[PDB]
Design a protein around this ligand. Structure first.
Ligand SMILES: O=C1CC[C@@H](c2ccccc2)N1Nc1ncnc2[nH]cc(Br)c12
Length: 167
């Protein structure tokens, strides 16, 4: 038993809710919150900008040190950093950005990072301003992640549609 509440169960291991991941994190304080990152860990907008703002920019400060030491992530890759006031850890995961011209097949690789963590609070990767189809992304998530994932979808009409069309 865990502390996540109000989720629709999609499969044995995938759950979904119409909520702001930031508010879910503040309420639950999960072991792992997933950020929808870019390779530079520049948390300017979307989920990343919102999470970073909620940490009072501490996520960005930590991220800049990470990049200065290690260089950029790979598209499809991830790193584990602090969750600051929101979670124990933040798993920064880079899905492909179609608005940048990247290969959507890398979305499966991105979701594979979730399998290194028994339970996660996450957004849909590559959706929103990353330019991919959120229905697709949900399918890849369900078909790739085997650990317990709680998906927060902020856009209300998207949740509705994803709920009702999920095969
Ligand atoms: O609705 C959705 C679906 C796709 C995802 C997204 C991810 C990256 C960039 C744009 C959109 N997204 N957006 C949020 N999902 C959950 N929690 C949130 N908090 C603040 C935001 Br913006 C937000």
């Amino acid at each position: 038993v865990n502390s996540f509440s109000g989720y629709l169960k999609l499969t044995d291991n995938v759950y979904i809710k119409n909520a702001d991941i930031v508010e879910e994190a503040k309420k639950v304080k999960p072991t792992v919150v997933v950020n929808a990152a870019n390779v530079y860990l520049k948390h300017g907008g979307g989920v990343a900008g919102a999470l970073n703002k909620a940490t009072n920019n501490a996520m960005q400060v930590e991220s800049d040190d990470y990049i200065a030491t290690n260089g950029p992530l790979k598209v499809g890759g991830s790193c584990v950093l602090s969750g600051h006031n929101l979670a124990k850890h933040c798993l920064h995961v880079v899905g492909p950005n179609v608005n940048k011209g990247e290969d959507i097949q890398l979305l499966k690789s991105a979701y594979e990072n979730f399998n290194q963590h028994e339970v996660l609070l996450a957004p849909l990767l590559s959706a929103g301003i990353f330019g991919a189809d959120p229905i697709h992304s949900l399918r890849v998530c369900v078909d790739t992640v085997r650990t317990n994932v709680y998906l927060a979808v902020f856009d209300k009409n998207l949740y509705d549609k994803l709920v009702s069309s999920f095969l």
